[PDB]
Design an enzyme around this catalytic site. Structure first.
Site, PDB file in Angstrom:
ATOM      1  N   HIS A 499       0.779  -1.213   0.000  1.00 16.40           N
ATOM      2  CA  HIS A 499       0.000   0.000   0.000  1.00 16.40           C
ATOM      3  C   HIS A 499       0.830   1.292   0.000  1.00 16.40           C
ATOM      4  O   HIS A 499       0.946   1.964  -1.038  1.00 16.40           O
ATOM      5  CB  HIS A 499      -0.934  -0.032   1.195  1.00 16.40           C
ATOM      6  CG  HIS A 499      -1.982   1.025   1.161  1.00 16.40           C
ATOM      7  ND1 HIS A 499      -2.749   1.383   2.245  1.00 16.40           N
ATOM      8  CD2 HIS A 499      -2.409   1.797   0.132  1.00 16.40           C
ATOM      9  CE1 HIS A 499      -3.597   2.333   1.851  1.00 16.40           C
ATOM     10  NE2 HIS A 499      -3.423   2.614   0.575  1.00 16.40           N
ATOM     11  N   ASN A 694      -6.426  -1.064  -1.282  1.00 17.84           N
ATOM     12  CA  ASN A 694      -6.940  -0.077  -0.350  1.00 17.84           C
ATOM     13  C   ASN A 694      -8.360  -0.286   0.157  1.00 17.84           C
ATOM     14  O   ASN A 694      -8.601  -0.272   1.374  1.00 17.84           O
ATOM     15  CB  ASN A 694      -6.848   1.328  -0.961  1.00 17.84           C
ATOM     16  CG  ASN A 694      -7.375   2.413  -0.017  1.00 17.84           C
ATOM     17  OD1 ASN A 694      -6.681   2.812   0.877  1.00 17.84           O
ATOM     18  ND2 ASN A 694      -8.615   2.827  -0.185  1.00 17.84           N
TER      19      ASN A 694
HETATM   20 FE   LIG Z   1      -4.359   4.514  -0.138  1.00 14.07          FE
END
Ligand SMILES: [Fe+3]
Length: 839
Positions: A499, A694
């Site tokens: 991420h 995400n």
């Molecule tokens: Fe993000």
């Protein structure tokens, strides 16, 4: 009347400041009429007629005349203004304009439309930019018409203006950046520590060294700290070029401000409730965790009162307004509250969970390590082939048929285990999980190795060990704990690498390079910029509250103060070209090159949701880029000869990702093939890759037991009361091992914000303005791209509805894999692919 000075009717659409960012004492209205008189002046610039210098001719200062209230299609707190320019045909055709705001307060300029009924009929300018008072600018704000041009195609009168605007955007590399500045430049991550407050908050500078290579970030220029000249001093506002921080008509949509409020306001409130012992300090059973989204958690009146009025934060929990905070029920427990505990779900989440991109094929046994045994002790695996249940297959058959896989965190975590374990309340293992692809197409975990480094004089007697599946007795508890240690490794790698590093941090250097070297008139600028929306803004807020010393990540995840530097160690092996989906699948041994297939690769796990859905999105983006590029580059020589393009790429690599400029794999940008490749990868990372890693954070991680962020102790010894606890109270044994209740409340809150889609999001296949370019060809191509995405979604819907694919697409949690569906409504939806890394 006309006297060698004819009139051009134009319309200016703008938003008064009190529209994009309002608060009671922030509505200094001074309504519409204040914009009249001598408040705002625009000057048309000719694209066809030039002065004695070669620069297009400039018209007269023209002020707004009145409030136009004609067409309905005008919303978003916008206002239309009538204006007339004295522009005789001899002045040529306008291709740009200057604008000066004489008012004290800044306004948001949407666009200018010249209904010049003559040539093309209508000339459009899409501005979307804040215009501060004229005294604040070193040079007048200039905006261009929506035409697209490579440098060689820029009308001669506009050539100098184009370049000057780029020079303005680059600045000179010095000075403290101010709110109204629109200066793009690079700097290292030397702004995370806070040495002036305490030596304990001193952090290594990431970037600019061989010890700590790292992507660059946007320069802020606040200056050195008092105690350390290499560390940038603190600031209440972390600057980003002005238009990188556009507001929201709705306060609830300003999701990025949530982290700051959570860290500075909410966290201290939670802490007091615990310090005053107003709530049990630890979870005592799994039901205590389930309670958070059922009846909720009871907290002191003033803690509820501190939380309840804050924008964004107030959207995170339901409340009675007095003592209760109730989190939303996570998707993972919506059908079965216990399914997360199954071995089926544990393995399935490796291909369809929050972090579906780390699993690798295993072609030899036992697994090997590339780490120095002189430092860590013998690195040979202790997992024996004969102890594994491979559904009747022998090890050689499993290996040859490509049915053996692994989630390997051994080499990644081993170098950090000793220092992490020296911390109070942090104990981890460097884990390795072996998986077998069953004949039914699902994955099953068959062994977990929990490794610890061993050096002379180790004070600790803890040893490495292999744990195998077990459904009963203390053995089943040990195996459940083994899965927990693996997921702590996975959660950390996901948060910091999959991420943060791979999306947020890796993309910023490209954003900066684009504004510094590609003019707004550039086709590649128009192609890439939508994929940068809110990225620099979310990143700056992250440097301030998420990844800073004692920020949210350091206080909730296992590595603590070592978190961000671990991502620098991983960056040493980041490869731009390996970010391409097909290359990634091949590199990890989960797919093989196959020219006879549509996507060019054959998946080794046929029903691998992330990869199968991802290849469809990757193909749609490639088709779009392949159709767009030819519209402006006819041959490879045109690419090589584009001066802005060459400058952009040279800088993105040698400066933006400068610590890796010495790598052999950087694509050159001398051919059409190269250009399509670089753009395709950039778009992939910003949209689909980021969405996939995400938007499943709260849906899967909303139940701390499913995705623990930290482990606090190693496995207990047989003759200790802790060992006795595993036998008598496995839930308590589990809870004492994973993230404590307080950091859990804080991390659940953060991932809830990060998994939410603002209602003003711009998704893949969408643009914020239908007139981004005048070129109907580019506009047709984009229409095809959007239609194709709708087509792909119908297909993914069919996949999720196909019963034969239920095992991997839904699992025992019965949660249809929708993370790669292109569209979504607002909220915590578990679907939808934004154009950019916007949260
Ligand atoms: Fe993000």
């Amino acid at each position: 009347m006309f006297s060698a000075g004819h009139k051009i009717k134009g319309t200016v659409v703008l938003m008064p400041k009190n529209e994009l960012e309002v608060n009671p004492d922030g509505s200094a209205v001074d309504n519409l009429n204040a914009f009249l008189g001598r408040s705002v002046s625009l000057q048309l610039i000719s694209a066809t007629k030039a002065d004695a210098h070669g620069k297009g001719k400039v018209g007269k200062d023209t002020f707004l005349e009145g409030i136009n209230t004609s067409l309905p299609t005008l919303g978003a707190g916008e206002s239309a203004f009538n204006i007339h320019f004295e522009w005789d045909g001899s002045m040529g055709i306008p291709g740009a304009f200057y604008i000066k705001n004489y008012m004290q307060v800044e306004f948001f300029l949407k666009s200018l439309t010249l209904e010049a009924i003559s040539n093309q009929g209508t000339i459009r300018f899409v501005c979307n930019s804040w215009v501060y008072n004229t005294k604040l600018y070193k040079s007048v704000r200039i905006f261009f018409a929506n035409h697209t041009y490579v440098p060689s195609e820029t009308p001669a009168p506009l050539v100098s203006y184009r370049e000057e605007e780029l020079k303005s955007l680059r600045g000179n590399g010095t000075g403290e950046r101010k709110e109204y500045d629109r200066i793009y430049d690079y700097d290292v991550y030397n702004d995370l520590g806070n040495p002036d407050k305490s030596e304990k908050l001193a952090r290594p500078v990431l970037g600019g060294s061989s010890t700590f290579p790292y992507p660059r970030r946007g320069r802020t220029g606040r200056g050195p700290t008092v105690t350390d000249p290499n560390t940038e001093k603190q600031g209440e506002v972390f600057y980003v070029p002005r238009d990188e921080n556009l507001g929201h008509l709705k306060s609830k949509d300003a999701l990025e401000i949530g982290t700051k409020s959570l860290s500075q306001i909410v966290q201290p409130a939670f802490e007091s409730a615990f310090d005053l012992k107003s709530t049990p300090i630890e979870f005592h059973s799994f039901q205590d965790v389930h309670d958070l989204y059922e009846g909720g958690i009871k907290l002191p009146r003033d803690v509820i009162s501190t939380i309840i009025p804050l924008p964004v934060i107030k959207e995170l929990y339901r409340t009675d307004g007095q003592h209760i905070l109730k989190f939303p029920q996570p998707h993972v427990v919506q059908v079965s509250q216990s399914a997360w505990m199954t071995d089926e779900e544990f393995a399935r989440e490796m291909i369809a969970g929050v972090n579906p991109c780390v699993i690798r094929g295993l072609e030899e046994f036992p697994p090997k390590s590339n780490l120095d045994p002189a430092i860590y002790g013998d690195q040979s695996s202790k997992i024996t082939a004969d102890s594994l249940d491979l559904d009747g297959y022998t090890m050689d058959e499993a290996l040859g048929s490509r049915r053996l896989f692994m989630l390997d965190y051994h080499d990644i975590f081993m170098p950090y285990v000793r220092q992490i374990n020296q911390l109070n309340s942090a104990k981890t293992y460097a884990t390795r999980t072996i998986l077998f692809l069953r004949e039914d197409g699902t994955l099953k975990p068959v062994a977990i190795e929990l490794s610890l480094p061993h050096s002379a004089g180790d004070l600790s007697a803890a040893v490495s060990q292999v744990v195998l599946p077990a459904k009963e007795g203390v053995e089943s508890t040990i195996w459940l704990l083994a899965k927990a240690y693996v997921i702590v490794n996975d959660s950390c790698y996901h948060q910091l690498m999959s991420h943060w590093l791979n999306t947020h941090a890796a993309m910023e250097p490209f954003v900066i390079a684009t504004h510094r070297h590609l003019s707004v008139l550039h086709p590649i600028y128009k192609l890439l910029t939508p994929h940068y929306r809110n990225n620099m803004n979310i990143n700056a807020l992250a440097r301030q509250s998420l990844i800073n010393a004692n920020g949210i990540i350091e206080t909730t995840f296992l590595p603590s103060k070592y978190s961000v530097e671990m991502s620098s160690a991983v960056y040493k092996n980041w490869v731009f070209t390996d970010q391409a989906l097909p290359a990634d699948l091949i590199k990890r041994g989960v797919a093989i090159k196959d020219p006879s297939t549509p996507h060019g690769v054959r998946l080794l796990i046929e029903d691998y949701p992330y990869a199968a859905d991802g290849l469809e999105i990757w193909a749609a983006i490639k088709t779009w880029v392949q159709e767009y590029v030819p519209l402006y580059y006819a041959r490879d020589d045109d690419v090589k000869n584009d001066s802005e393009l060459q400058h952009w790429w040279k800088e993105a690599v040698e400066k933006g990702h400068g610590d890796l400029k010495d790598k052999p794999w950087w694509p050159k940008l001398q051919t059409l093939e190269d250009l399509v490749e670089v753009c395709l990868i950039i778009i992939w990372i910003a949209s689909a890759l980021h969405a996939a890693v995400n938007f499943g954070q709260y849906p899967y991680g909303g139940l701390i037991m499913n995705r623990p962020t930290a482990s606090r102790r190693l496995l207990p010894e047989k003759g200790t009361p802790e060992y006795e606890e595993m036998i008598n109270n496995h839930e308590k044994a589990y809870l004492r091992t994973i993230t404590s209740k307080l950091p859990t409340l804080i991390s659940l809150s953060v991932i809830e914000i990060l998994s939410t889609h603002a209602s003003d999001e711009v998704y893949l296949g969408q643009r914020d303005n239908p007139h981004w370019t005048s070129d109907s060809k580019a506009l047709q191509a984009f229409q095809k791209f959007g239609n194709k995405l709708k087509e792909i979604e119908e297909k993914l819907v069919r996949r999720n509805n196909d019963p034969s694919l239920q095992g991997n697409r839904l699992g025992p949690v019965q949660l249809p894999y929708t993370l790669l569906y292109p569209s979504s409504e607002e909220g915590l939806t578990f679907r939808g692919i934004p154009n950019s890394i916007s949260i």
